[PDB]
Amino acid sequence: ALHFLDINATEVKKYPTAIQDIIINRSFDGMIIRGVFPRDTMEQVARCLEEGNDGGMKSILNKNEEFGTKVAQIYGHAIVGQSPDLKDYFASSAIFRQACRTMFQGSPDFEEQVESIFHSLSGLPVEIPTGPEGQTYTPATIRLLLEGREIAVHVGNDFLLMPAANHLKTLLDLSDQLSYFIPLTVPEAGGELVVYNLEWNPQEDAHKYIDEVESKFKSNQSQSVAYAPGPGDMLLFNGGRYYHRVSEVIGNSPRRTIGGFLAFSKERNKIYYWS
C-alpha cells in the first residue's frame, strides 16, 4: 500500500532528497534507518531512565493517567493538546533538552546525531524552532508504553489545526508533517507501528479527538503495513498524511521511544523538528 525504504544509517548520504521525496513528490511514504544510534547508547539511556538517574527528566513525566491504556506516558510536554500560550510547553522544553543532552553523554548527542540525519536526507539546515520570545521548542519527547498499553489511531496533520500550533504554523510550509522516532527499548512483542493507506481528510481536547478518530477510521476498510524498528533504528515517515497507531505492548519489558516531528520551513529554506 505504502512504500517504505529500509537503509543503513551509513548510507543516508546517498538519499539527499529523501525528505523532499516523501513530503513534496510523495514518491514514497517512509523509511527505516538502521543504527542511527549504537545499541550501547540506547541501553545506557534506558537504564538512566529506569534507575531514575536521568538528569531530572522524571520531573516532566506526564503519566496521562486519565486516558487509561490507549496512550503513552510521556516525558516532556508534547505540543499536542497544549494551551496556545505555551508557557508550560516552553519550560518543559528547556528541561528536556538539558536532561537529554546529559543522558546521551555526547556518545553521540541526541540533537547532533538526529540533525545530521535530517541534513543528510535534505541537504538543508535543520533547526529546533525557537518561540516568539526566544523560548525553545523541545526536539523530542520520550514515550513510555508499559505492558497492555498502546497508542490509539491518529494522524499528524490534525495536530497543526490545534490552538497549540498557532505559533508554529507561522514558521512552517503548507506541506505534510513527518513523524520520526527511535526505540530506546523494544518489547518482547507488540508495540509495532501500524500504518494505514487512509489519508488525512483536509475537509476534516485530545480526549474527544481520540473518540472521534476511532469511529472515523472504523468507517473505512483500508490496507495496512506494520514496522518494528529495533533499539537505535530511526523510523521516519509521513505520519502527517497517513492514519497510524502503535499496537499493544506484550510482556514485561516496556516500549520506550524518543521522537517527534519534522517539516519544511515557510519557504522550504530549512527543516524544523520538534515534539
Ligand X SMILES: [C-]#[N+][C@@H]1[C@H](c2c[nH]c3ccccc23)[C@@H](C(=C)C)CC[C@@]1(C)C=C
Sequence ranges of the binding site for 2-oxoglutarate: 143, 154, 179, 244, 255, 257
Q: Least CB distance from residue 255 to ligand AKG, whole Å?
A: 7
Residue whose CB is less far from Zn ion, 89 or 261: 261
Q: Does 143 bind ligand X (CB under 6 A)?
A: yes
Q: CA-CA distance, 217 to 198, in Å (whole number)?
A: 8
Enumerate the known binding-site residues for Zn(2+). Answer: 154, 244
At residue 42, what are phi and psi to the nearest 5 degrees? -65, -40
Say which residues have a Cβ less than 8 Å from residue 95's Cβ, sequence separation at least 6.
56, 57, 59, 60, 76
Binding to ligand AKG by CB under 6 A, coded x per residue (else -) over 182-221, reads -----------x----------------------------
Is 39:119 a contact under the CB 8 Å cutoff?
no
Cell 536521568 locates to 54
Candidate list 154, 167, 255, 256; residue touching ligand X; CB under 6 A? 154
Pairing mode of beta strands 141-145, 73-75: antiparallel
Residue whose CB is less far from Zn ion, 41 or 82: 82
Residue whose CB is less far from Cl ion, 156 or 190: 156
CB-hemisphere CA count at 13 Å for 36? 33
Nearest to 169 by CA among 259, 91, 79: 79
Encoded amino acid at 225, one letter: V
Q: Least CB distance from residue 236 to ligand X, whole Å?
A: 15
Binding to Zn ion by CB under 5 A, coded x per residue (else -) over 235-274, reads ----x-----------------------------------
Candidate list 64, 102, 253, 265; residue touching ligand X; CB under 6 A? 64
Cell of 150: 498502546
80 binds, among Zn ion, ligand AKG, ligand X, none (CB under 5 to 8 A by kind): ligand X
Q: Least CB distance from residue 64 to ligand X, whole Å?
A: 5
Q: Does 246 bind ligand AKG (CB under 6 A)?
A: yes
Q: Does 157 bind ligand AKG (CB under 6 A)?
A: no
Enumerate the known binding-site residues. Answer: 143, 154, 179, 244, 255, 257
Q: CA-CA distance, 181 to 136, in Å (whole number)?
A: 20
| Angle (CA) 89 98 230, round 5° | 90
Pairing mode of beta strands 151-154, 178-185: unpaired
Nearest to 73 by CA among 93, 87, 57, 95: 57
Q: Least CB distance from residue 154 to Zn ion, whole Å?
A: 6
CB-hemisphere CA count at 13 Å for 14? 8
Return residues touching ligand X (CB under 6 A). Answer: 64, 67, 71-72, 74, 78, 80-81, 143, 151-152, 154, 206, 209-210
Return residues touching ligand AKG (CB under 6 A). Answer: 143, 151, 156, 179, 181, 193, 239, 244, 246, 257, 259
